[PDB]
């Protein structure tokens, strides 16, 4: 069974997720704070991490930040919220792959964890090398992007999304298609694609507009 | 005179390594992706392969996975960027024999290729009889490890490490001794390769029981029961 590490400082929530994930067929490790999470992720390399944000000792954004800083691309789904002020999440920018807002039904978590694992296990490899869209160069196998020769600092899932868009440059890919290709969903009511699209547009334009949102149709990377 | 196949999708790096290895005495073949690598390895069997992990068409992990599935034990050193930890570890886990991180100086690669060739296909051990360590049996001639009667699936270099440790059962061997005995190194190296493999090996042994593979901090590693 895939090993899922669940991290939450609320012991009731932690036990409830542990039980439900185990009954859904996962091997489950648990951690009560970010320090314990990092220890567990080290001792027992999990296939995916479900990570609460607000915790003592070391919080969830710090855990994501540390994992990514250490070149650990383990799939991470954060249990977060959108700020009230300023609609930020709150772990995604720092490097998490997906999110869920409490309270949530277990089926929503299971669906997201299976998607995390489906992406993680994918061995599909493109023939694409470096793809050019105006001033943007996307080195697909090298996982680097530059705009006018200047590196664009992207998270793993920001780059995964940019990569798919560039593999199909000039094509309009719908939210459902991107949920499938980039997040590995096979089922959803989530805004996570739209959020990440906004992240990419902001980083890419830090510039002509290269990433377009075509309302009711989808998203497209194309030299304006 | 030994034939080395070098594989990298960065044409500048590929060209540099081709030049440098040829000057250093090797017959060099090149490939730009994993499909070209498999074709080259198939059509003119190299003595060693230097293999970039991240490439289009077929990546280095897939290359190694294919070679090992076909029971081709050709030595492979995988290359990767410093930050691409997960990728090079994946290539080691899939069966590669060593790694080198980019960027590197050519001497570091030449040294690792000479080592690969020294330790290609058979171990610095002479035991014939299967060696027992509690529930573990290491049959060096048969290249088989079993724990409580069930095979442990090890890569070639994982098995090489276990075989040296079992030949020297109960004895502590240091990281530098293991680089020389298992990896064939004759030079000082900055590498985590021994630790990486000790980890994979330990995880596989522990598998179904007792810890048999012990790390003696500051001293080395030892295979023994209890
Ligand atoms: Mg909390
Ligand atoms: Mg490459």
């Amino acid at each position: 069974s895939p090993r899922v590490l669940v991290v939450d400082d609320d012991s009731d929530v932690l036990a409830s997720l542990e039980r439900g994930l185990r009954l859904s067929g996962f091997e489950v490790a648990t951690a009560v704070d970010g320090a314990e999470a990092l220890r567990s992720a080290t001792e027992n390399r999990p296939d995916a991490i479900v990570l609460d944000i607000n915790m003592p000792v070391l919080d969830g954004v710090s855990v994501v930040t540390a994992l990514r800083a250490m070149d650990n691309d383990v799939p991470v789904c954060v249990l977060s919220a959108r700020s009230s002020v300023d609609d930020r999440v709150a772990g995604l920018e720092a490097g998490a792959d997906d999110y869920l807002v409490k309270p949530f039904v277990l089926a929503e978590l299971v669906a997201r964890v299976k998607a995390l694992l489906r992406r993680r296990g994918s061995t599909a490899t493109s023939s694409s090398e470096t793809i050019t869209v105006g001033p943007l160069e996307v080195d697909i196998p090298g996982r680097r992007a530059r705009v006018n020769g200047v590196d664009v600092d992207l998270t793993k899932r920001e780059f995964d999304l940019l990569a798919v868009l560039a593999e199909h440059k000039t094509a309009v890919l719908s939210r459902a298609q991107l949920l499938e290709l980039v997040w590995g969903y096979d089922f959803a009511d989530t805004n996570v694609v739209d959020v990440f699209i906004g992240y990419l547009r902001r980083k890419l334009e830090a510039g002509p507009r290269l990433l377009h949102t075509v309302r009711g149709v989808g998203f497209v990377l194309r030299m304006q």
Side-chain angles (χ1 to χ4, degrees), chain A:
Chain A
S1 300
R3 181 167 190 82
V4 176
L5 169 56
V6 183
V7 189
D8 199 301
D9 55 316
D10 183 313
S11 57
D12 263 17
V13 168
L14 184 60
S16 180
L17 298 177
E18 178 185 13
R19 181 167 290 106
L21 289 182
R22 186 154 40 236
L23 289 172
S24 294
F26 296 101
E27 184 184 277
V28 185
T30 58
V32 305
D33 64 45
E36 197 186 2
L38 288 175
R39 176 162 288 279
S40 191
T42 289
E43 292 177 341
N44 328 296
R45 309 137 140 243
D47 299 309
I49 301 178
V50 172
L51 181 53
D52 182 43
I53 294 299
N54 296 156
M55 305 182 291
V57 181
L58 192 67
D59 61 282
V61 172
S62 289
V63 171
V64 173
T65 302
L67 288 171
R68 303 312 193 221
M70 294 181 290
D71 309 311
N72 191 334
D73 285 331
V74 60
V76 172
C77 179
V78 294
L79 310 179
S80 189
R82 300 156 282 250
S83 303
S84 54
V85 106
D86 24 8
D87 304 323
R88 250 63 103 23
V89 188
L92 288 185
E93 308 174 0
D97 301 300
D98 204 351
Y99 78 116
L100 250 178
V101 182
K102 291 172 182 167
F104 59 82
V105 62
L106 177 60
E108 301 175 88
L109 180 62
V110 174
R112 285 172 173 64
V113 167
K114 284 166 172 187
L116 285 182
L117 293 165
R118 191 167 295 118
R119 289 315 306 155
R120 188 197 177 252
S122 176
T123 65
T125 115
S126 159
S127 60
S128 300
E129 308 176 2
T130 297
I131 294 169
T132 293
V133 178
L136 172 66
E137 278 197 346
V138 184
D139 172 0
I140 291 294
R143 293 187 63 92
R144 87 115 176 84
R146 289 176 172 165
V147 174
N148 287 132
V150 170
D151 184 75
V152 172
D153 186 21
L154 300 176
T155 68
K156 180 192 70 172
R157 186 47 57 86
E158 284 170 351
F159 185 90
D160 291 340
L161 174 60
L162 185 57
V164 171
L165 287 162
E167 285 282 12
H168 295 100
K169 66 167 169 168
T170 86
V172 176
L173 293 178
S174 63
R175 178 181 303 105
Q177 284 166 330
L178 292 162
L179 278 174
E180 181 168 282
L181 298 165
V182 175
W183 271 267
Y185 286 28
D186 64 3
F187 62 101
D189 186 14
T190 176
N191 69 357
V192 70
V193 181
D194 309 77
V195 169
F196 273 81
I197 289 288
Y199 295 163
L200 280 182
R201 273 147 67 108
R202 279 150 29 205
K203 300 193 172 183
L204 289 169
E205 293 166 20
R209 171 106 89 211
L210 296 183
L211 181 48
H212 309 275
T213 298
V214 191
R215 181 67 62 229
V217 189
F219 306 92
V220 53
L221 188 69
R222 185 187 158 95
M223 174 53 181
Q224 158 56 250

